[PDB]
């Protein structure tokens, strides 16, 4: 299989209680590096300058395309447990207005920062055959600061097969029932989250694990779940989704085999109805 990943690459400032670091973050890139395991990944993003080493880790998991822009999307993250987050934003990228028209197996739109227009997921949903999302970037403001968040309509998004959002984003959808979509992943962080296949619920329980800060998560969580979806049953994909997931928060990375995330992934809960 061959992947699209939309959404801007982020220069990320993690602070962690005393303790401050830079280092590359965005949706697109997370969700590009659990997909990277799966298939043949492009990134098409938004930023200015990066790190050379940085760039060198996105070249080495993906082709890039780079929409140019006089700016690169900044996120400040201070967590104060492993979930519990405030996010900042310093600086904001150019939006994303083309896809490509090339062929994909697979277009996940990931944006961070309003980069992607609700309009794209409309052209996306007609060029291209499977479109999956995550709804963060479309639900938060797109000036500077601690970031706020604006409801939207969410009749754009029939037809996306797989869409994930956290359970304080969810509340800012509307005019929206899980049914909208083949699969909706509701996620809870370290708690039990939910999952519904055609409008069916299912509740999952992730694998415990201790971490200092949890960024990425969602996004490897609906990475991943897009590359054990497409060759798994629906049950078994989502616990090797949790468990993928529950590995990469440990080793924050992917660099892991599948036998570890299958073994993992047997002892993951996930209940009907
Ligand atoms: N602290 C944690 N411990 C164990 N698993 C976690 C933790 N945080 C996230 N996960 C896993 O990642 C998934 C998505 O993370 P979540 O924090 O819900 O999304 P987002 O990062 O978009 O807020 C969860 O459903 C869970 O499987
Ligand atoms: O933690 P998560 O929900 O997967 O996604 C995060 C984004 O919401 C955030 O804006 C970005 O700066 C992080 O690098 C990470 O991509
Ligand atoms: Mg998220």
Redesign the pocket.
């Given at each position: 299989m061959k992947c699209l990943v939309v959404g801007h690459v982020?220069r990320?400032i993690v602070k962690k209680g005393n303790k401050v670091l830079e280092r590359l973050?965005?949706?697109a890139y997370?969700s590009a590096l659990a997909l990277s395991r799966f298939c043949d990944v492009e990134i098409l993003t938004s930023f200015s300058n990066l790190p050379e080493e940085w760039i060198k880790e996105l070249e080495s998991m993906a082709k890039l395309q780079v929409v140019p822009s006089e700016t690169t999307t900044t996120?400040e993250?201070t967590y104060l447990d492993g979930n519990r987050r405030r996010?900042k934003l310093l600086e904001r990228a150019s939006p994303i207005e083309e896809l490509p028209d090339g062929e994909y197996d697979v277009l996940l739109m990931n944006p961070?920062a309003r980069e992607v227009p609700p309009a794209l997921v409309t052209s996306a949903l007609k060029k291209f055959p499977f479109v999956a999302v995550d709804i963060?970037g479309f639900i938060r403001s797109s000036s500077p600061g601690e970031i706020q968040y604006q409801p939207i309509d969410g009749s754009f998004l029939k037809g996306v097969k797989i869409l994930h959002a956290d359970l304080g984003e969810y509340q800012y959808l509307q005019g929206f029932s899980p049914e909208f979509v083949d699969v909706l992943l509701l996620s809870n962080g370290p708690e039990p989250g939910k999952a519904f296949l055609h409008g069916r619920e299912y509740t999952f329980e992730p694998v415990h694990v201790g971490v200092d800060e949890?960024?990425?998560?969602?996004?490897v969580f609906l990475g991943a779940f897009t590359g054990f979806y497409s060759q798994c049953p629906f049950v078994q994909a989502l616990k090797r989704a949790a468990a993928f997931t529950a590995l990469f928060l440990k080793n924050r990375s992917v660099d892991f085999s599948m036998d570890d995330v299958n073994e993992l992934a047997m002892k993951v809960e996930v209940k009907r109805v």
């Open positions: 982020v990320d973050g965005g949706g997370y996120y993250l996010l961070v963060q949890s960024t990425g998560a969602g996004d």
